[PDB]
Design a protein around this ligand. Structure first.
Ligand SMILES: Nc1ncnc2c1ncn2[C@@H]1O[C@H](COP(=O)(O)OP(=O)(O)O)[C@@H](O)[C@H]1O
Ligand code: ALF
Length: 395
């Protein structure tokens, strides 16, 4: 699939060597562009960062928290930069010349400046960002973190030239497309409440697949995913294989998407993966076992295997977990649901409020039939922060 003109504008400018921030509608094409950029930019200098576990596996690796070798905190630059200045953190900090980032919406502001001086102090250069080709990407109308990074003082002073993307590539029908922006900008008519309310009835989930529901908080999804599991009668089959070399919670927590324990039963809904398939990106599925041999849509069932999820712990050092790429569907968490293109989802709008959670949830659904909104979006669902002002001064 050839790139749009809007996209290829970004490609050439990063190839030029310029720090370039570009933003885009949910499904603008943003994160696919970095797939071409990372293929375009040359190993040895590129780091492939992001702000969640799930954002880094879509792209390359490393989750900012991890790569920087720090975890925000009230440690001034001093401890931070000294914590930045151990081996693995340094050696990796020094060699990079182009630092891609993704899902910048989530990174707090203070993290940026603290990350900022840290980048300079290690490299010793007093260029804007330690003189890194600093690529950035994300949409601030999706999930917040307060104080997004553009409020940070390093921002703009890093000299990023702001670019924009349009023509949403994920949803084909303009009727659905026009919907999200109405929600995105925080504007709800009935023709922004009734198209969906109408839909609530839908049946979603082709064959054996079920609607992967989305939730406001992480705990419900932990419970709701599992309650369904114990309910399903059959072989427990909870093999897992948390084969982590140390005994550290953080590696399987932040910096990778894994749970140490994968209680995969006989027929519960297994969703997501690690891409690396011509026909299977990150879609939900289930089937019989012999080695899960899981069937998702597309009608493609093959045998699934566990791999390596390399991580850099804080203060240097590398821990790695070796678990299966799959995770339990049934109810995906919404904050973990950025950077996702989900064919079939279902969400309850009514108690799910936060400058974005509305937008972010539905927008991750290709076509309207997949989206299984529930409780009427009686306005209030669509809340907004007035960050639109920043996108508004983008004359
Ligand atoms: N230039 C392009 N060529 C092919 N597919 C694209 C392009 N731009 C966007 N897409 C589609 O958009 C999806 C990725 O959406 P993306 O913009 O990365 O999500 P988000 O905007 O939420 O980060 C992919 O499935 C891909 O097929
Ligand atoms: F803006 Al995105 F996944 F990068 F919705």
């Amino acid at each position: 699939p050839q790139l749009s003109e809007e996209q290829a504008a970004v490609l050439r400018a990063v190839l030029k060597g310029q720090s370039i921030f570009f933003t885009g509608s949910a499904g603008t094409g943003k994160s696919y562009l970095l797939k071409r950029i990372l293929g375009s930019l040359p190993p040895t200098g590129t780091v492939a960062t992001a702000s969640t576990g799930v954002a880094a596996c879509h792209i390359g690796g490393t989750t900012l928290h991890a790569f920087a070798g720090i975890g925000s905190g009230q440690a001034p630059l001093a401890q931070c930069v000294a914590l930045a200045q151990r081996p693995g953190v340094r050696q990796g900090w020094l060699n990079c010349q182009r630092l891609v980032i993704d899902e910048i919406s989530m990174v707090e502001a203070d993290l940026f400046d603290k990350l900022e001086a840290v980048a300079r102090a290690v490299r010793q250069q007093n260029k804007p960002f330690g003189g890194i080709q600093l690529i950035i990407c994300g949409d601030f109308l999706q999930l917040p973190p307060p104080r997004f990074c553009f409020q940070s003082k390093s921002w703009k002073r890093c000299v990023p030239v702001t670019l924009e993307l349009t023509k949403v590539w994920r949803q084909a029908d303009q009727t659905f497309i026009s919907l999200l922006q109405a929600v995105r900008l925080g504007r709800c008519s009935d023709e922004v409440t009734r198209q969906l309310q109408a839909t609530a009835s839908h049946k979603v989930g082709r064959d054996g697949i079920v609607a992967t529901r989305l939730c406001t908080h992480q705990d419900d999804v932990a419970l709701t995913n599992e309650r369904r599991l114990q309910e399903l009668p059959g072989k427990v089959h909870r093999f897992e294989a948390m084969d982590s070399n140390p005994e550290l919670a953080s590696t399987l927590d932040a910096q990778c998407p894994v749970s140490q324990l994968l209680q995969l039963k006989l027929g519960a809904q297994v969703m997501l993966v690690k891409n690396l398939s011509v026909s299977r990106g990150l879609v939900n599925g289930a089937r019989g076992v012999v080695l899960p041999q899981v069937r998702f849509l597309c009608g493609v069932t093959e045998v699934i295997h566990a791999d390596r999820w390399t991580v850099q712990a804080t203060g240097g050092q590398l821990l790695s977990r070796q678990q299966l790429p799959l995770q339990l569907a049934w109810a995906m968490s919404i904050h973990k649901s950025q950077g996702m293109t989900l064919d079939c989802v279902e969400i309850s709008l009514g108690r799910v409020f936060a400058s974005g959670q509305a937008y972010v949830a539905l927008s991750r659904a290709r076509s309207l039939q997949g989206l299984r909104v529930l409780d009427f979006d009686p306005m209030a669902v669509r809340c907004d922060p007035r960050v639109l002002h920043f996108y508004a001064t983008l004359r």
